[PDB]
Amino acid sequence: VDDDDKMLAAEAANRDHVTRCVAQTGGSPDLVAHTAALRLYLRVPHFLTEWTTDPDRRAAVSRALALDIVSMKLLDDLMDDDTGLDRVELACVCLRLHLRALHELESLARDPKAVTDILEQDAVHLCGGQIRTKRSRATNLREWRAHASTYGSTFLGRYGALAAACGGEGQPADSVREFAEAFAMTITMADDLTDYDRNGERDGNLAHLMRTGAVAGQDVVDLLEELRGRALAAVAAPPGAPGLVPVVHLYTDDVLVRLLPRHL
Amino acid sequence: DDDDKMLAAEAANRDHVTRCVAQTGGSPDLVAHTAALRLYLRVPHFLTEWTTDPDRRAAVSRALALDIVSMKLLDDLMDDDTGLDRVELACVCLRLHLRALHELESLARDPKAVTDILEQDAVHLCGGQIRTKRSRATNLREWRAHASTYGSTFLGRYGALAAACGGEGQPADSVREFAEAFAMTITMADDLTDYDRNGERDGNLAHLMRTGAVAGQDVVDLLEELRGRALAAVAAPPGAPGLVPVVHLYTDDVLVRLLPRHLGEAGAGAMATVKFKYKGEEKEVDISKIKKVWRVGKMISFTYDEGGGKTGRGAVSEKDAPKELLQMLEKQ
């Protein structure tokens, strides 16, 4: 039973916890399905909880994070209003999953108060950030990374801090967060370079800037190597999460080998 | 001076919310939108009426304002008909909500009380709202059932939070009972108002009333039941007597101002009458047939229409004179 077996079971367990919850609160089949298809979002909590030694606590935190992350994803579906799903269901399920997550996370945190501390702390930076992102679209790598740092990095960094706050001891809280923020940007670039064709995205989209020449391929390669570097470092801080090393390489190499060639 | 406290409270909450909206990147339009939520911003003052420490009362009142508004922005976002920017709506919605959670948890008796309360009937509230829009109501019973989740349960939770964060002397169950009953009185008022302000029709109480699907007298009985429920909760020790005029104010407004717009010609249930014996017979006439009426000592004498250019006559003790007849006296 290797790490992949733990990852696959964590993902399935998070998916089930989420769908059960969407369904008991009125979610339509289409919404339950939409929810079941957010694969990475359901998997990411497993990486964030890699520093948690108790297997039972880790599964509990993992699925509580999955509930809020999916919740935020639905809130995001609600603002783009482009999924064809019923906005009432989207809004209601979004609220329901979020409140259940607060309940679950607070019941696992050493200090229940730590949960609302973390969520409030850079709430302005994350929310005001998302507004600016959608207002002024990016025109170069500097502007892109800046925006991605809020809806991507700050977004995941928060769940990083929560996983540390609800994971018991032996948790290097700042490294868990460092990890999530660097990893979040690697995957945000991935999404950008996948969503160009799957969604027909243009304005502010990194793939678009790449093709229109506003951004150089080498710069993009450098950014990825920088993020890889930052992620590997974060997981080497004591106590350390060696399990995440292959994960960092997996997602980074994929953007390099599979996705970048599609734009250059 | 409770009126001055109530007004100040609303302004204080307005201030706290708008600054918060502004600090997050909310546009002037959105800021104005939330500043216009008058009753939403005032309601927290009613919910914290049992809070003895003024400084704590103000802190709780504004934290509640924050979340109540946020939920209102969430609702604006699902209807997507305000013309406001969906991104700002979603982001400000989340930001205010997260701020409210932080403020409330800081005032709570117990660390888990805020999230316990929000989780408790979260499914009831959320699936409740989904079903409200999924199946429009077709009678008073159905209207009331839907209204009990997005109105009563909705405000009931903030009633529970006011009690949880308002230190000692809070009759948790009563604060919430008030919130749930008052929320429904307000919800009926919105329906009877928004019929014209918004052009709302499906599942709308005023529409059900005009359509004939719901009877005026039943609406009156419900409002009376709700006034009674609210008054009782407010009477429970330690008591919040200051809320009494408030309860009557809102209930009477629905009865006096709003209801008549949907019933018209005295939809006050049954056509009132006057019973009397005349020339040895049992007689009863509808106030609608009565022409002239005057007093002679404690007796009320009057005439009326019997059918055609025909005119009736009669006299009854004032003790047996219906309210309507007695009013016709003053009005004559």
Automatic annotation (TrEMBL), chain A:
Q: Superkingdom, according to UniProt?
A: Bacteria
Protein's name in the database: MoeN5
Which species?
Streptomyces viridosporus
